[PDB]
Design a binder for this molecule. Structure first.
Ligand code: GNP
Ligand code: GNP
Ligand code: SF4
Ligand code: SF4
Ligand code: MG
Lengths: 595, 182, 61, 70, 118, 263
RNA sequence: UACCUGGUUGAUCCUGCCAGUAGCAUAUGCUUGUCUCAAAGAUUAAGCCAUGCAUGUCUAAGUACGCACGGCCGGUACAGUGAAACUGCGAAUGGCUCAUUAAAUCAGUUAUGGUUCCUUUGGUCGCCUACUUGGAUAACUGUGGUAAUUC
RNA sequence: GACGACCCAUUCGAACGUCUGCCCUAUCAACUUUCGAUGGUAGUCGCCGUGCCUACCAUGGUGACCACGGGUGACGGGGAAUCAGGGUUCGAUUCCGGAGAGGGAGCCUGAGAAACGGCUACCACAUCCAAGGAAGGCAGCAGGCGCGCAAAUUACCCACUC
RNA sequence: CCUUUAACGAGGAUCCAUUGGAGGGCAAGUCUGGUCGCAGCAGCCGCGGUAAUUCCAGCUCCAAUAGCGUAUAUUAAAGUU
């Protein structure tokens, strides 16, 4: 049914004035195995996790109310809204789609969030244990009788609530559908709202341009636009804020916020920093084990829910384990040996062009055994430049050829290699620096073994991103080209993986061109920063490379947007466009505090 | 709301003498359980208690007159007592078996059309009888005296006028799809 | 046997005035809307938290 | 040992081979013998017996219409 | 935190407030809350101030005093019309009301008037 | 619960002479304040759907009373509940019907239809005499009318005929032995008989013997007696039953004699 | 139905308790076709609580210059329909719990000639302004502050 | 016709006061008093009567007919289970009366409240925050955690009854 | 839902009645196999030490029956308050 365990530290939990009744009257510490370990001492009482059967006897006759009782998460065939079959993922609860507010849905990766949306949409209908010899619009309505979802599902039947979703992935599509320029979006539908959507989407650029010439930005934009302009009753946004600019993301959240108020239901996902404050008004957290079981907790207020999700484990109200610092790198460390020797290369100030783009580079120092960070706004000319330097098109005048072999990290990842991932891992090698490495990205807590086997076709975003992360330190090459690793990863998985990537390429002597849109992702991974400046579909200047601080200040001076440090935990928190203090930071120009 | 029991259990759990009487009584009338017996004996012992009061009350007390007069009418109206008696002393001469004569299944068998008593209970339940104009399904009708000359079969049944059953009309369709087209 | 209860009005308008609504709509000439239940209360509490202008919430959510 | 007092009680186990269906350091449910204070039969010092191991009866474990849930 | 009168030195003080005082809205009759407010005496700790023009100077500031907006409404009461247009007691007011134009409605323009009282 | 006055009365708390059931819901009507007391009232709506059965639901009575077909004491009332009690006249002028509220020998408010000529007045007991300002007297009655300048020999426990049209009583009865009386409360209720004797105690709770024309003597408190007219000669119309107060045995005999439950 | 039976001894008669027996109400095991009625987080923690909802209210008849709808043209109490806002009234009723509480609570009986009472019902209604007096607030219009509030 | 207002009566009550009625315990037998205990006189206060309170004065009041003290898994009653007669045991719980809304105290409004779906403060908790501040009380219906041997749907609806 | 009514709907193998007990108290086996003071049963009295009417099983039988068993509070039995 569930799990139970004891917890011990408290304000004057005093093992030096209680005689220690917890050790004296615990059944486990009597049959031989020391569950509770304590003495008359200066520290705290120690209590194990694994050996505690549950009971609560120690709690009822500890002389100080220091020891409380937690209950750890476990499956016990309870609710069970659906399963695929056996030895496979299952979900228990899909809960209230409260109207007039937007419902924010916030859990680790591979937990069933997307699956809950599929069920809510009426498309993949729920199976509820079994196997699923009951459907049909009767038995499930009888099962969730006495509640609410009877009224919801009967209104769906009858298609009184019309379904729309923004899909999780880009790739299969710009591949599965096709799009007539202008005409397409045009004979989409209808008026004033599309003009509001495309204009408040802050694009003004792709009105006269074919889809195939566009990138992430354009794609997402058009997508959201059409989705909204789509005359319907319900509305779902899965993952709407991936691989988009920081300024542009805020103006996406408020265009979503337009649809909410007058008896309409709305479900959003997301893996946020502190922008979820403007996305949603109810936050609903999901827990469990990645790719095994997922449980949805009942919804909370956004402020209250946010911290309790990143706090490290908030229950009351249940309970769990893990969860804590991750909104950064707090990986206090630095320094090396003597670094000898090195070089000074240097790449020249090339001028590049395509058709509707004037793209310019400035000369800079690309140091041996050292990171380089690219940004800067969407459309600011970063990716196609790197391909043009390596070999694809260019140059008209001059260039520098790579001294070292080359590792290509791609951003447009939707690969097609039929058979298995294990077959593709043989085009790399699993003997080299054989001591952990892929195993040091992930193995013990989230599992890999988890990265082999299975098909790449059915693999989810962050795991698919990890396939690409492996494909880079896996052919023999030492100069690394990486665009957007923060794509489809959260905070828990991204920050540790990013620190591991930096440790590899710095320690055995390499250089990597990282193209992050993540404060935590960009910062802890930065040095030079190089800054890209200029307006989309016009002009791109890579600013002559300067200081992490000075380059980040150039990016945020033009945009007009800033961050605050969470003072207890060292965590970033975005500002609300225009505030009070949002004026001291603008003047002090300082957008980072506490180096 | 308001509920109460209609029977009581015996004080002794077992007693060779008692069990034979309860068994052989159930055999005669086709009763399902002892709960159908003790039910009768609760009502009777209740009536035997009320009577036992009024005999000790003063003769020509107004309470004693009005109760007895309207009581004995009810005992005569169901026909467990005669009006050639008509006094309270004969209440105590009343006993268990006289009631059971006025049960529906007993009156079907005794004064109507049945085989053995075990048959007659089935006819009551399978809706082949009526009481004056009204179908019944309860063999515990206990039947008022006036209504004994209106016990008849039902007016929609294969017993008397009305549509046949599904054993006959089945076999009729065996002449048309069992040997007429099959 | 079956037993019911019947009215007979002298004119239409005497029925149409007096008559509980569902009995008139029983053989149609009236309906209901209105619209289910709930959408009323959640709007009411939102209207409560504005002053002067509540025309957004009445149409607008 | 009990949940809500932490004090100790010595409890009989019924029919043959039902001892095996009780495993150490699990929960159980106890109950008096049916004499309401006094030790019953030829066994001294025991005033309690055992009925359910873990939401499952000693009967169904013994008879074989249920199995251990672990 | 708002500024009210009669709240000498400029600290932030929590006063009892009720109906008929600055910076209070009752949500129930007889209700009394204890909100914080801030003093009269001006410092540079303030976000914004409201200055009312009292005396008009020689010059005309371009964005305000050059702009001219007429006041909207005439009186609704009887005796204010009498005082305004300086009528006698006997003249029988019935045509001395302001007529307020409805500019458009896609039909025709109306001229509205209020309803006299007393 | 209480901190101020209550506004509900349930089914089972309510009196038994309104003859309420128990399979309609928890609440009962509760009469609103007026001249009569709630253990002596017949609320209006209980007359219209638990007696006469014109109405069937409380919402129907709300649609009826608004039309102003109802009167009570010659004036017009227009609410679901009004606390009419003993000796008042209801008047529906559309049907041409007039009722009177009076007691059965059972002790409950019956239907006592009457001529419209009879329904132009009612009989009212005097309860208190009170000298007002500047040498003016007053009366006080159980229907709570204050009638100024009465005749100066009328005293409490007398009864007076009031003309509903103009007030200002025309005539009266004087409380005397051998006059005919009706009971209005207590264990004896609805019995009619002459006074016969009085009994006085200095203090309170004086009693009043009564005897009827069936040769039975009984007594009741003073303050439950109401005068109806001089000896064996009511100045009102009387219902069937007529205060005989039959035993239960004799009532059985009547029913099986006429054999009356069908027409 | 005002009822007893087994157990101290080699055997008998007592004293006496234990056990057997029937009802009732809580928990629990095993089993379960059809029909009606329906009790249900009191026992222990009057422990702690996410979210949603549970108290509002306009007639012919207090106040309509919403740039609202409408008009058949208006305003000369002046429309018909009318959001908002001031005003009147209710929110002290109900629902829930059993912690406190041993002449206290409470029940029967009595007392206001020791007092208060919204409301209803009935009475009470003449020792350069009166052809109608005085001056401000909301909605509304427009400009704002705060990370945030029915500010 | 509608509304409002002064007084009297009426209705719905409210508040004090009379007489009688109570479970276990003496390993609880003397208790109460200028920190008013009982009474007298005058005054204050209060809707009114009154040691309710204050000044002055007296020395009383209560108890083996069980006071005083302690205990109660004690809210009271209408009732319920068992029962030949007499009894015994139970009564949180649908009607009536009472008390209380996390623990204490104070107070506004009103005819009516020492109100908690009103307010202010302290104490115990717990929430948000840009750390400047702000907001809260499910023993209401559902629902969750905890506690235990032990107890239901975050359903539908003002048609009935009010 | 109930009542009312089309059309399908019973050959006993399934359109399947269980819960306890059979030495005495107390209604029903000095039947068959296994165990041998072991394992267990037993409110109580007592059963098991190789011929067990009481244990573990089979067959048969008995009681109540859509109910029956078990634990605990409490009344009757108790003229053992
Ligand atoms: N075998 C199998 N597994 C599937 C299928 N669809 C989803 N899964 C698995 O179900 C788990 C969760 O899927 P999903 O809901 O997409 O996860 P997520 O929480 O959305 N992942 P992320 O946080 O990275 O965005 C994963 O382990 C995934 O592999 C399928 O068709 N077959
Ligand atoms: N006019 C035009 N634009 C093109 C063509 N090919 C690509 N682009 C667009 O030109 C821009 C170049 O910047 P790019 O390096 O793609 O930006 P990014 O690194 O993808 N930035 P972001 O991820 O924030 O969206 C992109 O928006 C891309 O879609 C082309 O042939 N013509
Ligand atoms: S926990 Fe309670 S018991 Fe264990 S040590 Fe701290 S105080 Fe002493
Ligand atoms: S909880 Fe149960 S197990 Fe863990 S310590 Fe307290 S008692 Fe020992
Ligand atoms: Mg996903």
């Amino acid at each position: 049914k569930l799990t139970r365990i004891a917890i011990v530290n408290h304000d004057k939990c005093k093992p030096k004035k209680c005689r220690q009744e917890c050790k004296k009257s615990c059944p486990v510490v009597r049959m031989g195995k020391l569950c509770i370990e304590v003495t008359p001492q200066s520290k705290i009482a120690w209590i194990s996790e694994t050996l505690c059967i549950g009971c609560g006897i120690c709690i009822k006759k500890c002389p100080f109310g220091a020891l409380s009782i937690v209950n750890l998460p476990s499956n016990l065939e309870k609710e069970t809204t659906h399963r695929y079959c056996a030895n496979a993922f299952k979900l228990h609860r899909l809960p209230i789609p409260r109207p007039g507010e937007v419902l924010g849905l916030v859990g680790t990766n591979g937990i069933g969030k997307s699956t809950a949306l599929k069920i809510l949409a009426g498309k993949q209908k729920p199976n509820l244990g079994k196997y699923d010899d009951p459907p049909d619009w009767q038995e499930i309505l009888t099962y969730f009788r006495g509640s609410e979802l009877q009224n919801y599902f009967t209104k769906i039947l009858e298609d009184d609530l019309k379904a729309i979703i923004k899909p999780q992935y880009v790739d299969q599509i710009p591949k599965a559908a096709k799009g007539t320029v202008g005409s397409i979006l045009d004979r989409k539908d209808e008026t004033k709202t599309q003009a509001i959507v495309c204009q408040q989407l802050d694009l003004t650029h792709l009105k006269e341009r074919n889809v195939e010439d566009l990138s992430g930005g354009e794609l997402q934009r058009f997508a959201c636009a059409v989705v909204c302009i789509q005359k319907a009753d319900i509305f779902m946004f899965d993952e709407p804020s991936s691989y988009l600019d920081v300024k542009q993301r805020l103006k996406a959240a408020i265009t979503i916020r337009s649809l909410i108020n007058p008896d309409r239901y709305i479900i959003v996902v997301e893996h946020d920093l502190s922008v979820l404050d403007y996305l949603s008004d109810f936050i609903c957290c999901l827990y469990g084990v990645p790719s095994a079981y997922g449980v949805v907790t009942m919804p909370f207020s956004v402020r209250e829910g946010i911290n309790i999700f990143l706090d490290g484990y908030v229950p009351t109200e249940n309970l769990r384990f893990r969860d804590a610092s991750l909104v950064f790198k707090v990986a206090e460390t630095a320094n090396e040996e003597e670094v000898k020797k090195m070089c000074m290369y240097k790449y020249p100030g090339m001028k590049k062009k395509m058709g509707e783009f004037e793209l310019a580079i400035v000369a800079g120092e690309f140091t041996d055994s050292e990171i380089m960070v690219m940004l800067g706004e969407n459309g600011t000319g970063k990716t196609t430049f790197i391909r043009m330097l390596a070999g694809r098109l260019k140059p008209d005048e001059g260039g520098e050829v790579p001294v070292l072999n080359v590792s290509y990290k791609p951003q447009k990842i939707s690969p097609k290699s039929t058979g298995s991932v294990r077959q593709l891992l043989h085009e790399k090698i699993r003997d080299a620096y054989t001591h952990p490495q892929f195993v040091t990205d992930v193995m013990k807590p989230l599992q890999i073994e988890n990265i082999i086997d299975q098909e790449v076709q059915t693999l989810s975003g962050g795991e698919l991103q990890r396939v690409a992360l492996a494909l880079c330190l896996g052919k023999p090459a030492d100069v690394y080209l990486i665009d957007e690793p923060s794509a489809y990863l959260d905070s828990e998985q991204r920050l540790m993986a990013a620190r591991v990537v930096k440790r590899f390429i710095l320690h055995a002597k390499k250089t990597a061109f990282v193209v992050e849109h993540d404060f935590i992702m960009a910062t802890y991974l930065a040095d030079r920063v190089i800054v890209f400046d200029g307006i989309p579909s016009k002009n791109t200047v890579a600013n002559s490379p300067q200081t992490l601080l000075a380059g980040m200040n150039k990016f945020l001076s033009q945009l007009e947007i800033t961050f605050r440090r969470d003072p207890n935990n060292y965590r970033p928190r975005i500002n609300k466009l225009n505030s009070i203090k949002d004026v001291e930071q603008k003047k002090s120009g300082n957008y980072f505090f506490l180096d | 709301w308001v509920c109460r029991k209609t029977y009581v259990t015996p004080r002794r759990p077992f007693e060779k003498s008692r069990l034979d009487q309860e068994l052989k009584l159930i055999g005669e009338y086709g009763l399902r359980n002892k709960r159908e017996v003790w039910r009768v004996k609760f009502t009777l012992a209740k009536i035997r208690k009320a009577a036992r009061e009024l005999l000790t009350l003063d003769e020509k007390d107004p309470r004693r007159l009005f109760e007895g007069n309207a009581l004995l009418r009810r005992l005569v109206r169901i026909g467990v007592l005669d009006e050639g008696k008509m006094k309270l002393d004969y209440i105590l001469g009343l006993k268990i078996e006289d009631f059971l004569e006025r049960r529906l299944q007993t009156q079907v068998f005794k004064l109507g059309l049945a085989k053995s008593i075990h048959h007659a209970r089935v006819l009551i339940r399978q809706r082949h009888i009526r009481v004056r104009k009204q179908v019944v399904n309860i063999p515990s009708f206990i039947v008022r005296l006036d209504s004994q000359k209106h016990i008849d079969f039902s007016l929609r049944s294969p017993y008397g006028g009305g549509r046949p059953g599904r054993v006959k009309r089945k076999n009729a369709k065996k002449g048309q799809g069992g040997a007429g087209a099959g | 046997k079956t037993t019911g209860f019947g009215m007979i009005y002298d004119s239409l308008d005497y029925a149409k005035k007096n008559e509980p609504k569902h009995r008139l709509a029983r053989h149609g000439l009236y309906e209901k809307k209105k619209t289910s239940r709930k959408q009323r209360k959640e709007r009411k509490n939102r209207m409560k938290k504005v002053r002067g202008t509540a025309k957004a919430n009445v149409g607008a959510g | 040992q009990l949940i809500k007092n932490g004090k100790k009680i010595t409890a009989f186990v019924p029919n043959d081979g039902c001892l095996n269906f009780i495993e150490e350091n699990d929960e159980v449910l106890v109950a008096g013998f049916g004499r309401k204070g006094h030790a019953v039969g030829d066994i001294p010092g025991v005033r309690f017996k055992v009925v359910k191991v873990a939401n499952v009866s000693l009967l169904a474990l013994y008879k074989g219409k249920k199995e251990r849930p672990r | 935190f708002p500024m009210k009168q009669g709240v000498l030195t400029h600290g932030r003080v929590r006063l009892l407030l009720s109906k008929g005082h600055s910076c209070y809205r009752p949500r129930r009759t007889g209700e009394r809350k204890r909100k914080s407010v801030r003093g009269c005496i001006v410092d540079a700790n303030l976000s914004v101030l409201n200055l009312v023009i009292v005396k008009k100077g020689e010059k005309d500031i371009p964005g305000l005093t050059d702009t001219t907006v007429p006041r909207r409404l005439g009186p609704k009461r009887a005796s204010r019309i009498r005082k305004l247009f300086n009528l006698s007691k006997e003249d029988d007011v019935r045509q001395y009301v302001v007529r307020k134009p409805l500019n458009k409605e896609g039909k025709k323009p109306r001229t509205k008037a209020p309803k006299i009282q007393r | 619960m209480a901190r101020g006055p209550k506004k509900h009365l349930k089914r089972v708390a309510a009196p038994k002479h309104w003859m309420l059931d128990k399979l309609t819901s928890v609440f009962a009507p509760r009469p609103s304040t007026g001249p009569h007391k709630l253990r002596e009232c017949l609320p209006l709506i209980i007359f219209l759907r638990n007696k006469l059965k014109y109405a069937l639901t409380g919402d129907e009575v709300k649609k009826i009373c608004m039309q102003r077909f109802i009167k009570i004491d010659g004036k017009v009332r227009a609410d679901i509940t009004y606390p009419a009690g003993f000796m008042d006249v209801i008047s529906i002028d559309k049907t041409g019907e007039n009722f009177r509220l009076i007691y059965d020998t059972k002790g409950r408010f019956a239907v006592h239809r009457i001529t419209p000529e009879e329904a132009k007045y009612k009989l009212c007991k005097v309860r208190k005499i009170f000298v007002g300002t500047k040498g003016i007297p007053h009366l006080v009655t159980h229907d709570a009318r204050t009638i100024r300048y009465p005749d100066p020999l009328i005293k409490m426990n007398d009864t007076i005929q009031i003309d509903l049209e103009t007030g200002k009583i025309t005539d009266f009865i004087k409380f005397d032995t051998g006059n005919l009386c009706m009971v209005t409360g207590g264990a004896n209720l609805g019995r009619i008989g002459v006074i016969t004797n009085r009994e006085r105690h200095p203090g309170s709770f004086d009693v009043v013997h009564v005897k009827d024309a069936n040769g039975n003597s009984f007594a009741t408190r003073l303050s439950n007696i109401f005068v109806i007219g001089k000896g064996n000669k009511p100045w009102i119309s009387l219902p069937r039953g007529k205060g005989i107060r039959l035993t239960i045995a004799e009532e059985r005999d009547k029913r099986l004699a006429a054999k009356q439950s069908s027409g």
